Amino acid sequence: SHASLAFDSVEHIMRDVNFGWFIRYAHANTASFFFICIYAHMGRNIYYGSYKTPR
Amino acid sequence: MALRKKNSLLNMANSYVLDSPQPSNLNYFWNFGSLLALCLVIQLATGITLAMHYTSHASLAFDSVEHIMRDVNFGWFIRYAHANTASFFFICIYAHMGRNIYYGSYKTPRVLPWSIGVIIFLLLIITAFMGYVLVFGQMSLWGATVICNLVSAIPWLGEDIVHFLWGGFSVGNPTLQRFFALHYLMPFVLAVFALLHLIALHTAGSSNPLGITSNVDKLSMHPYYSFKDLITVFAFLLMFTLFVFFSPDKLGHPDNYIPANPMVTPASIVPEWYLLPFYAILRAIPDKLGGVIAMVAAILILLILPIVDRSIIRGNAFKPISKLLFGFFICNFLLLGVLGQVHIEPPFIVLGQICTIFYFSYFLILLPMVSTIENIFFYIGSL
Amino acid sequence: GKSTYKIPDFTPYLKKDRNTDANRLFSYFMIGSFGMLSAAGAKATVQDFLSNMSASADVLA
Amino acid sequence: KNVIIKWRGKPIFIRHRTSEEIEEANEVNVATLRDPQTDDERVQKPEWLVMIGVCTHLGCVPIGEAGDFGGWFCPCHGSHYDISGRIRRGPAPLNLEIPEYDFADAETLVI
Amino acid sequence: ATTFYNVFVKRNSAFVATILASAFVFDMTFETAIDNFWDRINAGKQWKDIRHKY
Amino acid sequence: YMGWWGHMGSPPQKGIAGYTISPFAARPFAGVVHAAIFNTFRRTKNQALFVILPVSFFYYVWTQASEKNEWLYTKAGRHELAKAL
Amino acid sequence: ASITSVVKTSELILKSPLLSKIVVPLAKTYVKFSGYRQLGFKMNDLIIEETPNMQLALRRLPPTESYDRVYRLIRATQFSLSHKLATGNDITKPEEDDHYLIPYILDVEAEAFEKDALDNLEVV
Amino acid sequence: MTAAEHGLHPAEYPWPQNGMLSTFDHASLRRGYQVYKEVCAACHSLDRIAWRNLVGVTHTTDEAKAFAEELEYDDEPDDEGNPRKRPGKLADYIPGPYPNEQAARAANQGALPPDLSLIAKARHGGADYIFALLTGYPDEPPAGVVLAPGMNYNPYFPGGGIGMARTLFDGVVEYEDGTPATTSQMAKDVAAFLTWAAEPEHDERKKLGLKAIIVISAMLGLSVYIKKFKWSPIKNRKFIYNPP
Amino acid sequence: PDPAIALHEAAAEGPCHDFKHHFDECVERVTKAQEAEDYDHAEYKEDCVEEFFHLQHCINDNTADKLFRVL
Numbered sequence A: 001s002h003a004s005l006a007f008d009s010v011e012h013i014m015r016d017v018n019f020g021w022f023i024r025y026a027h028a029n030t031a032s033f034f035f036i037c038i039y040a041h042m043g044r045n046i047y048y049g050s051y052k053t054p055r
Numbered sequence B: 001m002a003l004r005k006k007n008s009l010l011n012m013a014n015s016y017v018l019d020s021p022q023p024s025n026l027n028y029f030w031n032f033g034s035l036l037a038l039c040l041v042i043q044l045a046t047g048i049t050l051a052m053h054y055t056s057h058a059s060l061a062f063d064s065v066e067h068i069m070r071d072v073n074f075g076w077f078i079r080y081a082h083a084n085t086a087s088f089f090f091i092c093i094y095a096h097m098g099r100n101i102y103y104g105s106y107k108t109p110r111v112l113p114w115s116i117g118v119i120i121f122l123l124l125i126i127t128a129f130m131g132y133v134l135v136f137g138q139m140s141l142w143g144a145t146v147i148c149n150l151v152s153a154i155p156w157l158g159e160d161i162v163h164f165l166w167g168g169f170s171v172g173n174p175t176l177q178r179f180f181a182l183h184y185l186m187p188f189v190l191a192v193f194a195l196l197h198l199i200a201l202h203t204a205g206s207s208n209p210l211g212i213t214s215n216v217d218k219l220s221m222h223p224y225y226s227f228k229d230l231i232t233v234f235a236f237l238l239m240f241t242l243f244v245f246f247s248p249d250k251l252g253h254p255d256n257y258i259p260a261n262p263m264v265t266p267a268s269i270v271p272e273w274y275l276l277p278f279y280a281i282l283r284a285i286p287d288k289l290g291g292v293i294a295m296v297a298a299i300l301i302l303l304i305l306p307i308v309d310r311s312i313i314r315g316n317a318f319k320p321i322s323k324l325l326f327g328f329f330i331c332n333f334l335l336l337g338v339l340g341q342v343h344i345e346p347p348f349i350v351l352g353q354i355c356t357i358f359y360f361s362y363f364l365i366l367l368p369m370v371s372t373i374e375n376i377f378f379y380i381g382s383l
Numbered sequence C: 001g002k003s004t005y006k007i008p009d010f011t012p013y014l015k016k017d018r019n020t021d022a023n024r025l026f027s028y029f030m031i032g033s034f035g036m037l038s039a040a041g042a043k044a045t046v047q048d049f050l051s052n053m054s055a056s057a058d059v060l061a
Numbered sequence D: 001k002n003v004i005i006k007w008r009g010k011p012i013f014i015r016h017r018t019s020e021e022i023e024e025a026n027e028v029n030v031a032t033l034r035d036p037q038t039d040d041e042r043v044q045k046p047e048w049l050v051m052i053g054v055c056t057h058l059g060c061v062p063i064g065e066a067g068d069f070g071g072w073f074c075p076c077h078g079s080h081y082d083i084s085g086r087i088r089r090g091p092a093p094l095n096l097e098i099p100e101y102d103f104a105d106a107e108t109l110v111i
Numbered sequence E: 001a002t003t004f005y006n007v008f009v010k011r012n013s014a015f016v017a018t019i020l021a022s023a024f025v026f027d028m029t030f031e032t033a034i035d036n037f038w039d040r041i042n043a044g045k046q047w048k049d050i051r052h053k054y
Numbered sequence F: 001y002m003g004w005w006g007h008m009g010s011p012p013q014k015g016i017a018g019y020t021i022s023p024f025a026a027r028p029f030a031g032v033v034h035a036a037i038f039n040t041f042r043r044t045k046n047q048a049l050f051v052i053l054p055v056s057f058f059y060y061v062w063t064q065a066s067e068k069n070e071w072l073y074t075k076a077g078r079h080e081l082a083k084a085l
Numbered sequence G: 001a002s003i004t005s006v007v008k009t010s011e012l013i014l015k016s017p018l019l020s021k022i023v024v025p026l027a028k029t030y031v032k033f034s035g036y037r038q039l040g041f042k043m044n045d046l047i048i049e050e051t052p053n054m055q056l057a058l059r060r061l062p063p064t065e066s067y068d069r070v071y072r073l074i075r076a077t078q079f080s081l082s083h084k085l086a087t088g089n090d091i092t093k094p095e096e097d098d099h100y101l102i103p104y105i106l107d108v109e110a111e112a113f114e115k116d117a118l119d120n121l122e123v124v
Numbered sequence H: 001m002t003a004a005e006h007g008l009h010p011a012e013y014p015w016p017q018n019g020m021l022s023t024f025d026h027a028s029l030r031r032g033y034q035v036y037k038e039v040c041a042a043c044h045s046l047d048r049i050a051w052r053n054l055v056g057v058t059h060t061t062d063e064a065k066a067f068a069e070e071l072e073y074d075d076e077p078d079d080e081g082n083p084r085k086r087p088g089k090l091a092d093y094i095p096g097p098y099p100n101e102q103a104a105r106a107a108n109q110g111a112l113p114p115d116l117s118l119i120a121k122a123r124h125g126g127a128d129y130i131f132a133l134l135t136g137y138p139d140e141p142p143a144g145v146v147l148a149p150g151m152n153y154n155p156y157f158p159g160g161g162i163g164m165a166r167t168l169f170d171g172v173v174e175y176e177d178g179t180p181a182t183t184s185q186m187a188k189d190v191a192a193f194l195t196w197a198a199e200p201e202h203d204e205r206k207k208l209g210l211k212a213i214i215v216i217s218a219m220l221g222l223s224v225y226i227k228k229f230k231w232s233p234i235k236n237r238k239f240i241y242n243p244p
Numbered sequence I: 001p002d003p004a005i006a007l008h009e010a011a012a013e014g015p016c017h018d019f020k021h022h023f024d025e026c027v028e029r030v031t032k033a034q035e036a037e038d039y040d041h042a043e044y045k046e047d048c049v050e051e052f053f054h055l056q057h058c059i060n061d062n063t064a065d066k067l068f069r070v071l
């Protein structure tokens, strides 16, 4: 987490750690998918009135 | 219907902290539950704060802890609070387990909260061991070395598993960074298990010191145990204050203020005081693998208390012989602790073995015998 | 022993001036003092503890 | 004298053993040895005891010259190694590992 | 003394206001008082006691 | 095994009358002096053996062990130490 | 352990003259030191009741016995929380320490153990 | 273990800072810094202490800036990217006598003089151990001790043979405050200074502890009254049983 | 001059006299034993460390307070 090493530690994950590339990409991409799904979920809730009483 | 009972979320709170029906005669040893929750909260708050200042990289870890001590505002307090509360956590957890053993809290119908509790105890040990390594002083490194090499005892795969834990060929940077991540996580796992053992307990409700039903005479958790818990909270905080402010290093090892040096092995490597009894049990067995199994068995054997206690009566308040046996068991557990920190020299070698035998024979021989005999004495005695 | 209208003896515990405002006020003074020290102690704890997040001495240099 | 060279973070004990030290090591009947080996099997040169100086029990580095067999004593659980670096007493199962070392010159070894 | 109860204690809003105002007063005065006490028991020892030389 | 308020799972109760007084009506510290002295002495006396016996035994054991250990690592204890190893 | 086991073993001891001569005096002192009588309990009040068998036995108690048991538990719980002991009539005298529950639990268990046996019978 | 192998355990000396309500004597701290600077700094670093740490403890801002400005520290490279030195600032750490471990060991017949920033916390005994060790070189080693070459006999050091020679002798320092610089005086001062270096929060910590103890005691007393008050209905409960 | 020197000497002659004499007698024995030949080829070489520790421990108990009082 130290700023002198942070960026380099992420490169170390990409280049040196076994499957580091996958774990890093999975984490970064799933952050995007998380938002797609959360918008979808909120969209579903707005369209179908899940926000009304009793919910 | 009142809101606290109507609303699903409030009602869960209500069921545990407010209307929860408690026996009306719980004594002060029922207060360790809440102190352990307080320790858990202090450790989370101080630990998360330390995490904001600590650097897990081995080139910087020790120095980052010095930076917390010297440069961060109140860093000294947060660090000492975290380190001392680790000790208090174990005092309270042993007290709580002591209460549970003496009063037969492990018997039906509370085997499940007891058994989940034994897992909480293992997680506390692992959490505290990893946290100790994060300082990366001499005891940090050498403790990690010794303890992770116990896994080498696993036949065939042992060596491979150790290198897998370390992320390398020795304890080093990879190990320290992974211990950071796990030490951060483990307390959350621990909190989940703590909550599970409470949910499991809620079906039977708390035991009480008489070991009879309390269904006949209940008291709301609040205000009565709320205010009773405050007394021990302030007693705990007084003890916390005396350590943290006036003797912050009494419970620590000086060698942990020397940076980790893989070359020099410290004069004596002992674990933190609260692991010492298990360390003594490990030393007692000469075989590597034997020692590891014995050490683990010393914790897992708690799981059989529900079976080996044959008594028709719950707990020891009314059982003079069981009370004496319990006294000897507890004093032996403290002797084991002391033998964990002496040098491996005569005559402590033989003594350590005898104390280890006594430890296991309590569960396997004496408690089953004594509890059977007392059953008979109550029956014949009251004819 | 038998009659439930004969209230058991509470004289060892009953205060003679139990319905006076002085009487209630005393107990609330204790409750309130405890709340006052808890408030002052909480404020001190919070203030000192959160200060860890303000610039450390090496950063201020 | 016994040196400590770091190699893969692990310490390497290099002892320059005397004639009489070699003799003392060659004495013990191989029969009575958790890990039965003679010095000849361990060293490729009797004057250069090269070991991975990590205890075979749990992984402390034995304090050299100390012991009861006056070689190395692991302080952790009290396992005593010899002048061959063989285990004599204490929990340790094996003798102190020997790395792959070669004398490139007679005055320099590689590990 | 009824009057004191009625003003400061009867309403919880008032009682909490009184407790917090008292906590404020206590906090400020206790700080000052401990500072002075600590300086008296550690007299001639502290930097503020030797600073004048420099 | 335990219910909730209103159906706690007590066997039926009948015939017990319970009485108590308000916390504001009672002296919280009534008879505290008598309790702190006489009651604590009674409770302590009745439990003293169960603490004294194991404590005294294990302290004696430790004392003997620590004294022997100390003595074995003196000059005087050279021979006994050599035999013990 | 089951009450049945405790009762059977006790009967083996009381049968043997030798055994009873050495065990009866010990058991009487044990019970005196146990000190449950000082809280106004009868021995049987202490038996663990959170088992299906014991719940059944308690349900089979005559109403009077049942109401008095509840009182002794409540009274004892109040002594416990007060850290007081019973005095006078509240102390259980040895003559009042009757095994009111043992016959009921022995019958419950007898049927449950017969049921287990008969679930394992083999037509010959 | 033999007593020799453990080291003689140091006496408990009455330090000014021993005592729940006691600070360090800052005059002693200042004197001890001067001992560090004129004796120990030849071999021992104090890497965790910055010039700014001395300010308002032992020295004014001006004195500490003067000490910093007398040294040269590594600057950022110049515009042609050549290395440069600058004068020290208060944020700079007190620099060590050696560039690395190897140089340190070479200057001390193989022994490595430890950094002293934490030595007071890193040894059993703390101040007492430092004082005992510095003052505890006997004129002659006890008959029969075989010292390894380059070792000196000191009973307080575990094993007895320490690579550090006796260094404090009457009048090696001339204190600027006129205090007689005897071996014992200098050892006491430097031991106090190093204790401060190890725990610089010491004075503040103990003051906050005093506040905590007072308030926590009061809250404990009140919590007992309140508990008793709220529980009195339960404790005082009385029953009348009429069997039905 | 160093206050310790005087205090240590006083404590050796006074309250720690038994231990002083033990250390002295030890030294005499060991020096004599070292004087004799084939000492180097002996199994056990006696030291005086133990007696020294007893003496120093004693001196320190009787001096600690006094020394720090005069600094």
Ligand code: HEC
Pocket: H035, H036, H039, H040, H042, H043, H044, H108, H111, H112, H113, H114, H116, H119, H123, H130, H133, H134, H157, H161, H162, H163, H164, H165, H167, H190
């Ligand atoms: C010219 C060399 C030299 C001087 C001057 C010197 N030291 Fe040392 N010191 C050493 C060496 C070398 C060691 C390492 C000894 C060893 O490990 O055998 C050492 C070790 C120490 C130790 C730790 C001993 C231990 O327990 O590991 C302390 C404390 C110490 N010195 C403090 C001081 C103080 C205080 C001063 C002067 C006021 C001082 N030193 C002056 C060379 C010196």
Ligand code: HEM
Pocket: B029, B030, B031, B032, B033, B034, B036, B037, B040, B093, B096, B097, B100, B105, B106, B110, B113, B114, B116, B117, B118, B120, B121, B190, B194, B197, B198, B201, B205, B206, B207, B208
């Ligand atoms: C983080 C650690 C723990 C916390 C926070 C915790 C908390 C609690 C709390 C609040 C209670 C209810 C009140 C009480 O009896 O004190 C309780 C009961 C219990 N706990 Fe724990 N506990 C912890 C660890 C353990 C461990 C390690 C064990 C067992 C080995 C255990 C076994 C039990 C049992 C059996 C009960 C029921 C006891 C009874 O009321 O009779 N707990 N715990």
Ligand code: HEM
Pocket: B040, B043, B044, B046, B047, B048, B049, B050, B051, B054, B065, B079, B082, B083, B086, B089, B127, B128, B129, B130, B131, B132, B133, B134, B135, B183, B184, B187, B188, B190
């Ligand atoms: C049950 C909860 C916890 C226990 C028992 C515990 C225990 C410990 C222990 C024993 C240490 C060694 C302390 C020392 O000597 O300095 C430590 C260090 C540490 N812990 Fe925890 N800890 C816990 C929770 C946490 C949590 C939730 C975090 C969140 C990250 C955390 C972060 C740290 C950090 C960063 C360190 C290293 C800094 C230091 O040593 O103070 N801890 N912990």
Ligand SMILES: CCCCCCCCCCCCO[C@@H]1O[C@H](CO)[C@@H](O[C@H]2O[C@H](CO)[C@@H](O)[C@H](O)[C@H]2O)[C@H](O)[C@H]1O
Pocket: B005, B008, B011, B012, B013, B014, B015, B016, B017, B019, B199, B202, F003, F004
């Ligand atoms: C401890 C911190 C405070 C937060 C609460 C702890 C979190 C755990 C709560 C979730 C676990 C489920 O908790 C469960 O919930 C329900 C209702 O809430 C309780 O149910 C109980 O109370 C309600 C009314 O209060 C009744 O309808 C019911 O007869 C009774 O059994 C369970 O006895 C409890 O086991």
Ligand SMILES: CCCCCCCCCCCCO[C@@H]1O[C@H](CO)[C@@H](O[C@H]2O[C@H](CO)[C@@H](O)[C@H](O)[C@H]2O)[C@H](O)[C@H]1O
Pocket: C046, C047, C048, C049, C050, C051, C054, H204, H208
């Ligand atoms: C919802 C809560 C509201 C936001 C909370 C605000 C968080 C931080 C506020 C204050 C933090 C810094 O504020 C500062 O605190 C520290 C104590 O910690 C005080 O400092 C005082 O005590 C400390 C030790 O206790 C000494 O080192 C210092 O010399 C002294 O001045 C300052 O006098 C105050 O200015």
Ligand code: FES
Pocket: B146, D055, D056, D057, D058, D059, D060, D074, D075, D076, D077, D078, D079, D090, D091, D092
């Ligand atoms: S670690 Fe080497 S002896 Fe156990």
